[PDB]
Symmetry: C3
Subunit: 145 residues, 3 copies
């Protein structure tokens, strides 16, 4: 009865918040997932989170989301965003809304981060708002429904 949203954390994201606190902050993947769960309860949906450093494991989770008729997918694939055509063609299989998000303003960083290979297979993109990027992406998917 409840809509299911899948959160896909990308390569190197298990290391969020484990670097120098003064320069990189302390936000961890665990805190992000808690904030997503907090907002999900108010929105009346379920959020399941998945993190991997393996491109094949990411694609196979996407395949599973297609077969399990997931209602919406949020993805911050990390560096994969800028070259992994395999994940791009995995996301293309999905028929539910796909929301791309980034904590940082990728369009103002190194040139290679300015381009996303997912642009044609996602509804839209959100970047630059830190932790709030995740919550805004969850909001975007729920409003799509």
């Amino acid at each position: 009865s409840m809509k299911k949203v899948l959160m896909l954390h990308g390569i190197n994201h298990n290391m969020f918040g484990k670097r120098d606190p003064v320069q990189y902050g302390t936000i961890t993947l665990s805190e992000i997932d808690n904030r997503l769960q907090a907002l999900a309860a108010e929105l009346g949906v379920q959020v399941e989170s998945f993190q991997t450093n393996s491109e094949g494991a990411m694609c196979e989770r996407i395949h599973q989301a297609f077969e399990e008729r997931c209602d919406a997918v949020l993805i911050n694939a990390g560096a994969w965003t800028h070259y992994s055509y395999g994940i791009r063609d995995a996301l293309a299989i999905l028929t539910c809304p796909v929301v791309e998000l980034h904590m940082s303003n990728v369009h103002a960083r190194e040139p290679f981060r300015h381009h996303s290979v997912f642009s044609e297979v996602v509804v839209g993109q959100i970047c630059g708002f830190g932790m709030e990027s995740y919550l805004l992406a969850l909001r975007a998917a729920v409003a799509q429904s």
Copy 2:
């Protein structure tokens, strides 16, 4: 005494034929392998099929094909065709004929699919003929040996 040919299916190809039949058809990897097995028997050769979504598993299968003195290799690496230099340098270890193939006319799709990073390490390429691309590739490999 029989020649052994290895068929390498690439990333996301386990999902062949599991999408909308009206838009994507119903051709599955299982149906492809059966038609390959039928042609191999008619041609007097052996065909072994392998699919993976892991770039390392694909490279390691190629290493195994080199050590096992495989007679010819057919590869449809999927999206890996357009960026995986790792699979490219794996194919370069082979000394048997290598045939690159695609079901679709990749040179008439998105620009990133126009270029194959395998071009310098394969005998040639076959694309655009759907199921027949696999059967033509097997014929090409047998004639190369």
Copy 3:
């Protein structure tokens, strides 16, 4: 005692296993032995790691961050020219990182001319064959002390 980590990249398990006349016989085992011999001479410890999985490489780099490795040597193979995932894993490190190659990559195919690691390494050593590894270990020890 100072610890240096040697990271061997994709396809490198096949070093020395190709045609000896054309590709030589230098193996990863022989390289690691020479590294251990020089490490004892230099008064440091060397640990070697090889993988064909991009995710496994990034996770070894995460472990190198947690274990407070003194220096990292990396010859990522073909990943050098496209794996932004490994690049962003290396960016987490705060110890000196030395990129190395046996061949003169800047005089090979154009795609090998560029390393996506250049902004996250101290420097690069290429072209000196087996000596590239030994020179890189010397570079890393001098960077620490």
